[PDB]
């Protein structure tokens, strides 16, 4: 060792804490409600809702989580110390990525159900969206993640790396991000070895898997932003509009 161990196991604690505070839903509560499923009747009610409702509905629920991700970023060690521009670039292109990762906690894999609006629901509540291929791609993603059996610490560190990405275009102080990214990579790897969990590094999904999903989302949005342009202009939360233009 040449790097300060005290400094790196400080970062591990800092990241895990910043996530712990901005974890939105506490896990024990997310788990105990896994026996709280949408009835066959309730599900039908969702899929016979209108596309411009299910979009407006989800776009609010999404922006709900995204807000917490922003808080995570702010409390993240050495994130604010970055340039104001870079600070935006990472959050804008990365916030949606983080949420998709966080979903695996609200996703039970035994029944392939996500915790949506109070209860667990299947892939087909979101039938009314018209982008039911992207939904399947999302559920498949959260399945692979749920298969890895992440700890809450590993979620904390993984999502941290998801946000801090120097390979994101538009970065002014790129070299500044590279350094921060590396220390977080070191911290993640150290914690995995501290816990014999090094095996999952290869099991992690490719960097392009979330590149696909997040862009596939903004693709189906531009469709909706054209079908119901006045709806997204008047109803959709501004933060959502700002991020997904």
């Amino acid at each position: 060792p040449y790097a300060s161990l005290t400094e790196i196991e400080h970062l591990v604690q800092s990241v895990c804490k910043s996530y712990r505070e901005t974890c939105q839903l506490r896990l024990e509560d997310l788990l105990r409600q896994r026996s709280n499923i949408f009835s066959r009747e309730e599900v039908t009610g969702y899929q016979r809702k209108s596309m411009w409702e299910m979009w407006e509905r989800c776009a609010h629920h999404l922006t709900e989580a995204i807000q917490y991700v922003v808080e995570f970023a702010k409390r993240l060690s050495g994130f604010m110390e970055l340039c104001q521009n870079d600070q935006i670039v990472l959050l804008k292109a990365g916030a949606m990525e983080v949420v998709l990762v966080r979903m695996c906690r609200a996703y039970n894999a035994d029944n392939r159900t996500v915790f949506f609006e109070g209860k667990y629901g299947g892939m087909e509540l979101f039938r009314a969206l018209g982008c039911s291929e992207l939904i399947s791609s999302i559920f498949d993603f959260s399945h692979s993640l749920s298969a890895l059996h992440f700890s809450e610490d590993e979620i904390a560190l993984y999502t941290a790396l998801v946000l801090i990405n120097a390979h994101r275009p538009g970065l002014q102080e790129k070299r500044k991000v590279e350094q921060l990214q590396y220390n977080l990579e070191l911290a993640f790897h150290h914690h995995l070895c501290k816990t014999h969990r090094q095996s999952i590094l290869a099991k992690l999904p490719p960097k392009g898997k979330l590149r696909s999903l997040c862009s596939q989302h903004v693709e189906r949005l531009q469709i909706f932003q054209h079908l119901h342009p006045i709806v997204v202009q008047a109803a959709f939360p501004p933060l959502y509009k700002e991020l997904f233009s």
Binding site: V70, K74, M80, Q84, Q87, L91, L239, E242, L243
Partner: peptide, 9 residues
């Protein structure tokens, strides 16, 4: 700007 507001720019 809203994102800028959320941070403090």
């Amino acid at each position: 700007t809203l994102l800028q507001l959320l941070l403090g720019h």
